Structure 1
C-alpha cells in the first residue's frame, strides 16, 4: 500500500529515497509532470505535482545534493524540472544507466524491463499503462498513482542488486564517475538548446524549392513521362523497364535504386545524374529545412535535442527530435544548412573542437602495433602512410587513387575487415580485396594479432570491453551460421574501438565542464557529435578556449600515442571550419 498525500510532510524528505517524477510525453522539453512518487524508509508516497512543486520544503529537498535520490532516467526529470525553474540534485543511482551498462542489448527503456533482469515483475511496462501512439494517455489518478509507486518501489528494491553486479563487472566507477555525471551535463546542453536562424532556413527552402522544380521537370522530359521520383518502385520501372538501363542489383520486391547503384548507371542516361541531384535536394528540403523548422521553438527559435544516453550498443550517444548529429557537411550545398545554426546571444561565437583520427589512435593503443603507433607518434597522414605500406611506395609515389583505397582499407579495419565488405566498398573483386587485406596485416602485424585475439576473447568470455570497461555481449560469435557469426566477429573487432572512443570523449566532456566552471567562463557546451564538441561563447573567450578545449580533450585519457584535437570558430556553425 501507499499514502496518497494531500500535502508534503517531513517524513517524505528523508536523506535517501527512490524518486519518480513522471513525464509521460516522449519529448520532455517544457513538458508536464503528471505525478510524483517517493519511497523511503518511512513509507511510500504519491504526491500531486501541483502541490509538491509549489511546496518550498519539497523543492529544497529536490535541490539538496546531500539528500540522495535513486531514479530511472533522471535526465528526463532533471530537464522537465529545469523548464519549471527547479534544480534536481543528489541523484546517486540511475537505474536506466545501470541497466544500460550491465547489458545494452536488453533495450531497457522502462523500469519494468530493468526489473525483469533481476526477477522482479511487480511493476507494469509504461506502454501497458499509457498505451501506444494514438491511444496514448495519462490514466486516472488511482491507476497512475499505483504505477508510479510501483516504479519507485522497484527502483528502491533494485539498486543493491544492480550495484552489486556493476561492482562484479568492475563497472561501478563507470556508472558513478562517468555516466551519471555525464547525464547532468547532457541535461544542461539539451536545456540550453541551439539557436536557429529560421529566416535563413526559410530562404534556403525557397531556393531549394525552385531547384527541385527545375530538376524534376528535367527528369520528366528525360523520361518522357511524369512519375513520383521519390518512389523507389516507380523510379525502378522508369529506369530498368522503360529506359532499359542495366540491372546490376535487385532488391527484395523489385530493383535497387540506391545512390551507389545510380553512380554506375550515370554513363547510360542523362536522367541518372538528375535523379541523384533531385535526391540530394529533396533530402535537404524534407529533412533539414522542413523537418528542422517543425521542431524549432517558435518563441526562442531554439532547437532542444534529446541525447539518448542509453541506446547504442557501443556506448555512443544518439540525438533525436532533431538529430543534431547528422547535419550535412560533406557536400557544399548541404553544408550551407549549418549557416542557420548560430550563437544564442549577440557577440557570441560557435567553437568546434574535434579529435583527429581517434578510432585509429585507439586501435594503435589497444593493438600495440609498433608501425601504427610510430605513424601517430610522427603525426603522419595515416591514409598516406597506409598506402605507402600496403602498396610499397615512397610518399612521393602515393597517387590520389592509392590514398583513397588505403583509406577504405583503414575504414574496413575499424569496422571489422572482410574481403567481401572491402570488395563491395571499393567496387573490386574479393580476391583483389583479400590481397589488400593481406598486405595491410603484413605492414601492421600487431593489428592482425589484436583482431585474431579479440575474436577469440569474445568467444571465451562471451563479451568484449572498452577502455573504461563498457561491455557488449556477443552470443552470436559461436553461431554455425556464417552470416550470423561473421556479424558478431565484426562487432568484436569494432566495438572496443568505437566504444573506447566514446568513453574518451565522454570523459573529456566531464573534464571540460569542470574546467569551464573553475575558470568562470560563460562558454557552454551545446552538442557532441561522436568525436567532436561544439560550444558557444562570448567572442572575448575565444582565445582562452583555443588553449583550454583541445588540452582538456587531449588529456582526457593517456594512451600509448598522443591524442590530437583540431578546432575552429566562427559566427555560425558553418563558419566553425
Structure 2
C-alpha cells in the first residue's frame, strides 16, 4: 500500500504513520569560514513525544549523500555515539547502524547495510580518530569492540555507565541502564518498550529508528549534567583512568589466548586415565560396585559402614575439605581425598574448556568486566581466568601465537607497598628504600636473626603472618586463615606472640587500625578518590577497600600506558589476572618490548605511590605456565 511504502525509496517503511518528510536550511560554517546555506533532509514524528530530547534525525545511504553534511563535524568538542548490532557475538554478526549526535543539530545516521561507497564514511573516520574530540557512549566497551574489529580507530571516550557507577559509590548492583539513569537524573521516561525486534532485514520501520535516535541524542544532556556532578565530588582522576581503559580492554578481549590442541588432548588422556585408576582404587577400597562415589550421602554411608574414625575415635559425619583435613591417618580417606582433588580438577577444567574454544579461530575469548567488583579489581566471565589453576603443567596448554613470544611481567607485594604508602609506616619505608622485601623483614624480626640468616621456612611464616595481620584479623582466627590458605598449624600462644611482636614494632599499622576502628565510618576512599559506602560497618572490608582499590588503580594506569607505548612495535596485550600483564610481540622486537613494559609499569606505579618504589619482574616466557 502507498501508506506503508510512503518512503520506500530511502529504505524507510511506514507502519503507523508518525513520520513526515521535512526540508529546511541549515546555517553551517563553510571550510573557508563562510556562512553557507544548505538545505537538508530530515524526518520527524507527527505526534510530539512528551520528552524534550532531540528527535530530528538524518539518514544517509548511497544515493542520499550530501557532501556538506560532514561540516557538522567541524569545530566540535563532544558528540553522541550509538550503534546497533544484529546479535551479540562480535565474530559472527555485523553492525547495522551508526548514529552521531551533535549539540543543537539532528542525529546523523549511517545505514551500514547500504553504505557501499567507502568515501561516505571518511568524516566518521575523522571524528572517531580525532583525539581532541570526545565521544559519548553507553556501555562503551561493547561499541569499542565492534568498531575496533571492523577497522575503526577511536581515541577519545567518555562512557556514561562508568560515571553512573562511580557516582553511585557501589550502593546497589542493579540498574545503571539508560531508562534508569535518565529517569534518575534528567527526570524523563524513555518508554523503552521495544522487545528487541529483528534487525537482520535490510529495511527498517519508523518505530525502530525513532527508538534508536532518542537513545543517541539523550546522551548529550546526560553528559552535560554528569560531568559537572562528578567534578563536584572529585572523582575525575578515577573516571579518566577508567575511560582510557576501554580500548586496552577491547584489545585484550579481541586478542584472546591460543590453546595447544595437541597438548590439551594428551593432558586429557593422561588425566582421564589417572582419574579412572583412582576411581577403581577407591571402589576397591570402598568395597562396593554400585556405589555412586559422586554421591555425598552414599559415600558417607560407605565410610560409616567401614567405620573410619578420628584420632579421638570419632566418626566422620561430613566429607568437606576442613573435615577431611582432620581425618588423615587412613589409607581409605587418603584415596578418597585424592579422588576429590582429581575429579574437581578434571570436571572444573578439562571437560569444561572445549565448549569455549572457537573453532574458526582456535582461541579462548574471555569476557572482562571492570566495575562489577566492589574492590574495582577486574573480573572474568564465561571462561573465568581466576578459576583456571596455577599448576605449571596445566597452564602450559596456553601458548603464544605462531612465530610469537610471550613477555610475562608482574608486581611483587604491590598491596603491601600500597599499605605502607597510605599508612605512612616508618620502618616499612626505611626498609624498602634499602631494597629488602617485607616478608624478609618480618621474618627477621620474628626470628630475631640478622638479614642473611633467614631461611625459606621462616620466609613462608612471614609470608603468612604479613597477610594475616596487615588487614586486622583478630589474633584467635589467625590459625584458621593460615590453615585455610597456607595449611600451617600455629599454636595459640605462638600466634599471640606473633601478633604482639608484629604490632610492637609497626606503629603505622596499629595507628591506622585504631583510627579507623574508633571512627566507625561508613564512607571510604582510595588514592584515586574512588569513593564507596558500606551499609553497615565491617572492619575487614574497611581496611581492605583502600589498598585493593589503589592496586586496581595502579594496574589500570599501567594497562593504559602500555596500550599506547606498544603501538610503535605493534605489540598486543593478552590477559591480566591478579597482578600480571602478558603481551605478545614478534621475536624481532623482544628486547625493546621488555624495556617498554618495564618503563610503563614503573611509571604507572610511581604516579600514585610517591615515597616507595615498585619493582617489576619480567621473564621472556614461552608459555604461561613457565618456570617460577
TM-score band by shorter chain is 0.7 to 0.9
**Is 2:352 aligned against 1:291?**
yes
User: Which residue in the other structure is 1:566 paired with?
Assistant: 617
**Is 2:157 aligned against 1:92?**
yes
User: C-alpha distance in 1, partners of 2:147/2:221?
Assistant: 25
Instruction: Note closer, same or farther for the CA distance 1:548–1:455 as it changes in structure 2 (3 Å cut).
Output: farther
Any idea what SS the aligned residue of 2:624 has?
coil
Report which stretch shifted further, 157-166 or 391-400.
391-400
User: C-alpha distance in 2, partners of 1:138/1:242?
Assistant: 64
User: Which residue in the other structure is 1:76 paired with?
Assistant: 142
Any idea what SS the aligned residue of 1:323 has?
coil
Residue among 585, 592, 596 paired with 1:548:
596
Output one character per residue of 1:155-177: Cα deviation in whole Å (capped at 9) or x when no partner: 3332233222321222113222x
Output one character per residue of 1:292-332: Cα deviation in whole Å (capped at 9) or x when no partner: 22211212212222211121111111122322344322xxx
Instruction: Note closer, same or farther for the CA distance 1:98–1:429 as it changes in structure 2 (3 Å cut).
Output: farther
Does structure 2 conserve the Cα–Cα contact (< 8 Å) formed by 1:342 and 1:571? Answer: yes
What is the CA distance between 1:213 and its match in structure 2?
0.8
The count of aligned residue pairs is 545
User: Which residue in the other structure is 1:168 paired with?
Assistant: 232
What is the CA distance between 1:398 and its match in structure 2?
5.4
**Is 2:457 aligned against 1:404?**
no
Q: What TM-score do the two structures reach when normalised by structure 1?
A: 0.83
Any idea what SS the aligned residue of 1:453 has?
helix
Residue among 556, 563, 571 paired with 1:513:
563
**Is 2:60 aligned against 1:7?**
yes
User: Which residue in the other structure is 1:197 paired with?
Assistant: 260
What is the CA distance between 1:556 and its match in structure 2?
1.6
Residue among 332, 335, 339 paired with 2:396:
339
User: Which residue in the other structure is 1:301 paired with?
Assistant: 362
Residue among 360, 382, 385 paired with 1:324:
385
Instruction: Note closer, same or farther for the CA distance 1:143–1:228 as it changes in structure 2 (3 Å cut).
Output: farther
User: Which residue in the other structure is 1:122 paired with?
Assistant: 189
Instruction: Note closer, same or farther for the CA distance 1:3–1:555 as it changes in structure 2 (3 Å cut).
Output: closer
Any idea what SS the aligned residue of 1:557 has?
helix
Does structure 1 conserve the Cα–Cα contact (< 8 Å) formed by 2:144 and 2:246? Answer: no
User: C-alpha distance in 1, partners of 2:225/2:305?
Assistant: 62
Does structure 2 conserve the Cα–Cα contact (< 8 Å) formed by 1:466 and 1:500? Answer: yes
Does structure 2 conserve the Cα–Cα contact (< 8 Å) formed by 1:20 and 1:37? Answer: yes
Does structure 1 conserve the Cα–Cα contact (< 8 Å) formed by 2:405 and 2:584? Answer: yes
User: C-alpha distance in 2, partners of 1:388/1:180?
Assistant: 44
Any idea what SS the aligned residue of 1:555 has?
helix
Instruction: Note closer, same or farther for the CA distance 1:533–1:310 as it changes in structure 2 (3 Å cut).
Output: same
What is the CA distance between 1:523 and its match in structure 2?
2.4
Does structure 1 conserve the Cα–Cα contact (< 8 Å) formed by 2:70 and 2:123? Answer: no
What is the CA distance between 1:289 and its match in structure 2?
2.5
User: C-alpha distance in 1, partners of 2:422/2:273?
Assistant: 51
Any idea what SS the aligned residue of 2:435 has?
coil
Report which stretch shifted further, 414-423 or 214-223.
414-423
What is the CA distance between 1:420 and its match in structure 2?
4.6
Instruction: Note closer, same or farther for the CA distance 1:67–1:357 as it changes in structure 2 (3 Å cut).
Output: closer
User: Which residue in the other structure is 2:9 paired with?
Assistant: none
Does structure 2 conserve the Cα–Cα contact (< 8 Å) formed by 1:96 and 1:310? Answer: no
Residue among 575, 578, 595 paired with 1:530:
578
For 1:337-486, list aligned pairs within 5 A.
Answer: 337-346=394-403, 348-390=404-446, 392-394=448-450, 402-427=458-483, 433-455=495-517, 459-460=520-521, 462-477=522-537
Instruction: Note closer, same or farther for the CA distance 1:302–1:426 as it changes in structure 2 (3 Å cut).
Output: closer
Instruction: Note closer, same or farther for the CA distance 1:529–1:218 as it changes in structure 2 (3 Å cut).
Output: same
Instruction: Note closer, same or farther for the CA distance 1:489–1:145 as it changes in structure 2 (3 Å cut).
Output: farther
Report which stretch shifted further, 29-38 or 161-170.
29-38
Output one character per residue of 1:402-426: Cα deviation in whole Å (capped at 9) or x when no partner: 4434322212234442335423223
**Is 2:120 aligned against 1:57?**
yes
User: C-alpha distance in 1, partners of 2:343/2:152?
Assistant: 42
User: Which residue in the other structure is 2:328 paired with?
Assistant: 266
Report which stretch shifted further, 274-283 or 197-206.
274-283
User: Which residue in the other structure is 2:546 paired with?
Assistant: 496
Any idea what SS the aligned residue of 1:7 has?
coil
Report which stretch shifted further, 277-286 or 144-153.
144-153
Structure possessing the higher radius of gyration over alpha carbons: 2
Unpaired stretches in structure 2, ≥5 consecutive residues: 1-48, 50-54, 484-489
User: C-alpha distance in 1, partners of 2:565/2:571?
Assistant: 11
Any idea what SS the aligned residue of 2:250 has?
helix
Any idea what SS the aligned residue of 1:42 has?
coil
Instruction: Note closer, same or farther for the CA distance 1:147–1:525 as it changes in structure 2 (3 Å cut).
Output: same
Q: What TM-score do the two structures reach when normalised by structure 2?
A: 0.77
User: C-alpha distance in 2, partners of 1:191/1:216?
Assistant: 40
User: C-alpha distance in 2, partners of 1:202/1:298?
Assistant: 15
What is the CA distance between 1:247 and its match in structure 2?
12
**Is 2:276 aligned against 1:219?**
no
User: Which residue in the other structure is 1:482 paired with?
Assistant: none
What is the CA distance between 1:396 and its match in structure 2?
6.9
User: Which residue in the other structure is 2:11 paired with?
Assistant: none
Any idea what SS the aligned residue of 1:467 has?
coil
User: Which residue in the other structure is 1:484 paired with?
Assistant: none
**Is 2:106 aligned against 1:43?**
yes
User: C-alpha distance in 2, partners of 1:25/1:243?
Assistant: 58
Output one character per residue of 1:122-145: Cα deviation in whole Å (capped at 9) or x when no partner: 24789x9459xxxx9999966655
User: C-alpha distance in 2, partners of 1:291/1:54?
Assistant: 45
Report which stretch shifted further, 418-427 or 306-315.
418-427
User: C-alpha distance in 1, partners of 2:300/2:355?
Assistant: 31
More helix, by proportion: 1
What is the CA distance between 1:204 and its match in structure 2?
0.9
Report which stretch shifted further, 430-439 or 182-191.
430-439
